[PDB]
Structure formats: structure tokens, C-alpha cells
């Protein structure tokens, strides 16, 4: 009796939320930007090709200087590349070879990694002796680590396979905040420009907005049909983009609290593994399982370009802070810079 | 100036490349195996005979290194992390003896996944003695869960062990054919299945994998020259 009426109340609340969202929807994004000049054909070329990794690449992260980047490979390796000269800076072996994510600190003095070992390893790059050693090993997650992003040199936000997210405090080893509410595996997280909020997508075809300080879920966004594998914030921070296994990408607005635009095509069947925005947010870059990457016009939902240089699936891609180039990794153990 | 910094960068790069060459030489000489069980399959005893989300075990057979990984502290939803094992040497799938239907469903999902379609599976039908004693007792039957066992006939290619009654031989060969049908329903020469009648305490099991992976490697070589 209690469960049935609780479910009825939850259904009524969902009906009210959907009614409010429908009432707030007066016009679509397609007709608003129908009068603007289309972006036209765009063509990017491969300028650099990073070689040296033995196994498939799982994650990459650009540094704040838009020059140094970090790459993670399941051979058990973290490699720091200088994209300008292609020279390798640091080669860090990993205790666990099943790495799935890597992070670069904004200050550039630390790096992070994690994977099937359920342990977030933080390595110091500016050691006195010059060698790279593990600075911290945060433990407590009961699932595989999927993503991690630094807030500062002493705080980090991580996502795990235990359907929960964590906010840790370095130099103590204890997670100060726990975010719960997801039912599926959390696959990716994206920090807002003000760092106050962050969006995380899970395997329940839903994304959730979490406030870092207080630590509750503020908004929940649905609309995808399969697991969400990628997420990225808009440059202005009032919206975000999600890529899922349903071969579609979606744009959600924080203030509108509903989906704004869907990017898909009939010939695209494979899912989306990575996604990111450009400097101005006009172009949306998404990595696909068909060994190719698609650049879409975010305002008009029109495909603007195709980046095809990888012989295997694209697992990760990122855009520099200045927006001068885009780095794409793939399972073929190669990283490519496109400009 | 630019010259000194670039020279230091070249020196660090060449040292890194030398270390990576040594690491690649080490890495290409070892085989990685993914150990998976359907539940209460007894693979823990096999591990004993040779928190943290994964466990590692390294063993040498005939001067050949093998690194087997067992998943621990991971939720029952395997559809995401299993993709990390798409380039291992083989997946050792242990099946006890309706848990059998669930094991068959897991094997069908592993067999038909896009990332694992070129990965071979070594099947270990563990607890042969338990199945033999259950068949001899007769209290538990397979026809209630698998009616097709009523019309099943022992294949002419069967090689039963001496002293084994025909009933247990028929039951174990029917269980093997249950997985064989799924394995042969797909996988047109890209991957193969190696069923084995094993117990949790046999010392030959380590040999068995050694006899399977080698075969796989040979087939892979035969795929490189377009001979098979």
C-alpha cells in the first residue's frame, strides 16, 4: 500500500514536471536560428600524429597552456606529449594496466588516473628529484573509475561504476562529498566554468546537475534512449551536450530545464563516445564508433564536417583552451591533432 | 635559449623512447587472459591452484608468461567494463556443472558482442564430479530445465573416460553441445571456443589453457598470411 501510493505520487510529480516543461516551451531552437547564415563547409587537417603508445588509448586531457597533453593507454602507461614539437615529456608506468580515465591539473603540477582498480591515483610532476612518483591513492569507490577532473590542487571530482560520484580532499585520502541518485553507471562528468556545478551522465539514459558545495542533485535531464557516454558544458555554462549509444547527440539548457536540439542522421547507427564544444560553442565535435568524428553546427543542427584519420574507434577527443586545435585519440594507439 | 632547451627535450625524448622500446619488448612477450565466472562456478579453487576491483596472477608454462585477471568488487552490470578486455589472448569462462541457462545467456552475449567478436573463449565446465554424483543419485534431473535432453543422443565422436556410466557422459556432452550450438551459430572463422571437462583440483588445467592459447596464436598467424 505504501509503495503503490509512493509510486503514484512520484508519477504525479513527473506529470507536473513534464507539464511545466511543455508550458515553458513556446518556440524551438530550429526556428529561432533559421534566419542566420549557415556555417558552411569546414575542413580540418591533421597536423601532428602522436606515436609511442602500445595499446588502445582510453582518455586524454589538454593542459591549461594548450601545449601539453596527457594520454592514458591500457598497456599501463601515462604519456605527456608536447603537441608543438611532438616530443614526449613524461612516461609514467601504472600499477594497474586497466586505466579508463586521466586528468590534467589546471596548475600543471599534478596528474590523475583511474580504472578497474577502483583507486584514483594522483601523480606529482614537479618533484624535487625530477622523477614522477605517485603522490596519492584515493580509495573508497566500489566500482571502476570512469572519469576524474580537478577542481584545484587539493580537490578532485570522480565518477565510478557504483552509480555514485565523489568529491575528495587531497593530502587526507577521504572523500568529503558523495553524490547519489544515479541508477546506472556514471560514464562522464563535466565541470562548469565557475566550478560551482557539474553535470554527470549515467547508464540510465539520464544526466544530473550537482552543486559541488552543498552536494545535492539540482536538476535531472532525460530524453536519451540508451546509455550516455559523453558530456560537455557549453562555454557560457548555461547549457551542455550529451552523447549516447542511440547514435544521437542532444543539447540541454539549464535554465530551460529541457532538451533544445538533437543532432543525428539516418546513416549514423553507431553510438557516441566523446563530445566537446569549440571556443565559441558554434561547432560541436563528437567521436563515433565508426572510426570517424563529426563536427555539427550546434545552432542549426547541420553537419559541418567529418574528421576521418583513425583506423579504430575514437575513444576520446578534446579542444584546447584557446580553441586552436582538437586532439583525438583512438583504439589504434595513435593520437592526432586536427586544425 | 632555444637550442639548449630543444636539445634537452631531444635527450629526454630518446630516453623515453628507449624505455618504451624495453617496455614493448616486455609487453609483447606476455599473454593476457580474462577469467570470468557465471557464479558459484568454483573458479576460486582454480585460482588457488594457479576494496580492489581486479586481481592479477602471473604464471609461467614452458618459459611462456601468462597474466590472468579476475574481476572483483565490480557490479553485475558488465556491459561497460568488459570492452576493456577486447585484446586479451583469451577469456576463460568457467561454468558450474537455473544457473546453467544464465551462464549460457552470458556466453551468448559475450560471443555476439562487437568488441569481443574476434576474442576466443576457453570454456571450463567445472564440477564434473558434482554433476556425476547428482546424475548417479537421480534426485535432480536436466529434463525439467532442458526438455530436449529427452531426445538427446550421445554423439559417436564422444570419448568417455573408463569407468564412466553412459548417463553422466550423455549429460556432460549435452551440456557441452548447449554451448557448442551458440558458439557455432556465429563466428565465421574469427574466434573459436575450446570446451573442456574439468574439475576444480586438476593440475592439467594449467596445461589445457597452454594447449589452447598456442592454437589461437597459430590461427592468428594463419590469418596474417591468408592461409586459413
Amino acid at each position, epitope marked *: 500500500s505504501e509503495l503503490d501510493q509512493l509510486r503514484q505520487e512520484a508519477e504525479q510529480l*513527473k506529470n507536473q514536471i513534464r507539464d511545466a516543461r511543455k508550458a515553458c516551451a513556446d518556440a524551438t531552437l530550429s526556428q529561432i536560428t533559421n534566419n542566420i547564415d549557415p556555417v558552411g563547409r569546414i575542413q580540418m587537417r591533421t597536423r601532428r600524429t602522436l606515436r609511442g603508445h602500445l595499446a588502445k588509448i582510453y582518455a586524454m586531457h589538454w593542459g591549461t597552456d594548450s601545449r601539453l597533453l596527457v594520454s592514458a593507454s591500457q598497456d599501463g602507461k601515462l604519456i605527456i606529449w608536447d603537441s608543438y614539437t611532438t616530443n614526449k615529456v613524461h612516461a609514467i608506468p601504472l600499477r594497474s594496466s586497466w586505466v579508463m580515465t586521466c586528468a590534467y591539473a589546471p596548475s600543471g603540477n599534478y596528474v590523475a588516473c583511474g580504472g578497474l582498480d577502483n583507486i584514483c591515483s594522483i601523480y606529482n610532476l614537479k618533484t624535487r628529484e625530477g622523477n614522477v612518483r605517485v603522490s596519492r591513492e584515493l580509495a573508497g569507490h566500489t566500482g571502476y573509475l570512469s572519469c576524474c577532473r580537478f577542481l584545484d590542487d587539493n580537490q578532485i571530482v570522480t565518477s565510478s561504476g557504483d552509480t555514485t560520484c565523489a568529491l575528495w580532499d587531497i593530502e587526507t585520502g577521504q572523500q568529503t562529498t558523495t553524490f547519489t541518485g544515479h541508477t546506472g553507471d556514471v560514464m562522464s562528468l563535466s565541470l562548469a566554468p565557475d566550478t560551482r556545478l557539474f553535470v554527470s551522465g549515467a*547508464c540510465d539514459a539520464s544526466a544530473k546537475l550537482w552543486d559541488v558545495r552543498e552536494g545535492m542533485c539540482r536538476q535531472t535531464f532525460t530524453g536519451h*534512449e540508451s546509455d550516455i557516454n559523453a558530456i560537455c558544458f557549453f562555454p557560457n555554462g548555461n547549457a551542455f551536450a550529451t552523447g549516447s*549509444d*542511440d*547514435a544521437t547527440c542532444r543539447l540541454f539548457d539549464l535554465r530551460a530545464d529541457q532538451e533544445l536540439m538533437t543532432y543525428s542522421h539516418d546513416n549514423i547507427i553507431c553510438g557516441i563516445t566523446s563530445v566537446s564544444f569549440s571556443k565559441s560553442g558554434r561547432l560541436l565535435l563528437a567521436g563515433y564508433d565508426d572510426f570517424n568524428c563529426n563536427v555539427w553546427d550546434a545552432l542549426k543542427a547541420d553537419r559541418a564536417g567529418v574528421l576521418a584519420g583513425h583506423d579504430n574507434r575514437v575513444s576520446c577527443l578534446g579542444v584546447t583552451d584557446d580553441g586552436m586545435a582538437v586532439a583525438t585519440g583512438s583504439w589504434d594507439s595513435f593520437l592526432k591533432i586536427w586544425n | 635559449d632555444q637550442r639548449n632547451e630543444e636539445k634537452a627535450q631531444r635527450e629526454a625524448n630518446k630516453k623515453i623512447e628507449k624505455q618504451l622500446q624495453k617496455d614493448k619488448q616486455v609487453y609483447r612477450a606476455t599473454h593476457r587472459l580474462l577469467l570470468l565466472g557465471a557464479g558459484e562456478s568454483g573458479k576460486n579453487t582454480i585460482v588457488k591452484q594457479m576494496t580492489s576491483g581486479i586481481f592479477e596472477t602471473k604464471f609461467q608454462v614452458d618459459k611462456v608468461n601468462f597474466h590472468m585477471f579476475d574481476v572483483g568488487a565490480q*557490479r553485475d552490470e558488465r*556491459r561497460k567494463w568488459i570492452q576493456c578486455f577486447n585484446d586479451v589472448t583469451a577469456i576463460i569462462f568457467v561454468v558450474a556443472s537455473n544457473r546453467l541457462q544464465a551462464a549460457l*545467456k552470458l556466453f551468448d552475449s559475450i560471443w555476439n558482442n562487437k568488441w569481443l567478436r574476434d576474442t576466443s573463449v576457453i570454456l571450463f565446465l567445472n564440477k564434473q564430479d558434482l554433476l556425476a554424483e547428482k546424475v548417479l543419485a537421480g534426485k535432480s534431473k536436466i529434463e*525439467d530445465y532442458f526438455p530436449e535432453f529427452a531426445r538427446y543422443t550421445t554423439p559417436e565422436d564422444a570419448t568417455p573416460e573408463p569407468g564412466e556410466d553412459p548417463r553422466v557422459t550423455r549429460a556432460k556432452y549435452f551440456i557441452r553441445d548447449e554451448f557448442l550450438r551458440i558458439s557455432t551459430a556465429s563466428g565465421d572463422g574469427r574466434h573459436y571456443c575450446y570446451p573442456h571437462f574439468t574439475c576444480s583440483v586438476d593440475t592439467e588445467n594449467i596445461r589445457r589453457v597452454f594447449n589452447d592459447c598456442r592454437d589461437i596464436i597459430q590461427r592468428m598467424h594463419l590469418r596474417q598470411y591468408e592461409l586459413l
Partner: nanobody
Amino acid sequence: QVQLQESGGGLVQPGGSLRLSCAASGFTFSNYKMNWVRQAPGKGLEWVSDISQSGASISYTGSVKGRFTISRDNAKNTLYLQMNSLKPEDTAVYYCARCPAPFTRDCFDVTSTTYAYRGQGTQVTVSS
């Protein structure tokens, strides 16, 4: 929003018949492979039957091979399970489940304890 609603079931005498229905919304039902599973009291979730996207590929478990019949209709975005010659061993909560990804041959995690793409099943009791 992916939504699955189960209808039908109840208390039936032994040897009776029943028709369970599964209504799907929030996704393209025509390109997903569907499953019927059950959870018996004091027991874990058990897979019962499955049907492909077009309905050509149909499979059942051994215990209901000759008794249950699974079907789908894409026009009304619906799924049906016809159960005949019911026995007290069939008393369980039945769930209608969807595969995590479309255009995908295999189907993972449908029998897991927590699964997002699974609705609230209906109770079927067989007793006199």
C-alpha cells in the same frame, strides 16, 4: 524518458491461462530487442523469454518452452506474453525488459538486480 508499464496478471487457479502486456514509451520500440523475465519469491531474477526487433527470432527458457508465447507489435509499441497451463511454480513477479542499445545482437544486464530499462512487473500467483 524511457518508460515500460506492465499490465495483466493476478491470481489464477492451476491449469489456467493469462496474457501479460508491456507498453513502451520514450524510445523507438521497433529497433529494440525485448525480453520477459521473472523473479520468484525468495529467489533471484530469472530470464524467461526474448524476442528480436522484427519478431523473427524468438527464444524461451526450458521450463516454459512449450507453454509460453512471446510476441510484439510495433504499430502500438507493445509486447505480449501469453501463458498457458499455469502451475504453482510460475508464481512470480514478471518484468518486461529492453536491451541497453539498439541495432545490437546481444543483450546484457537484463537479469541484473538493478536495471534502468526495466519496468515494474506484475504479480502472477497460481494457487487454489
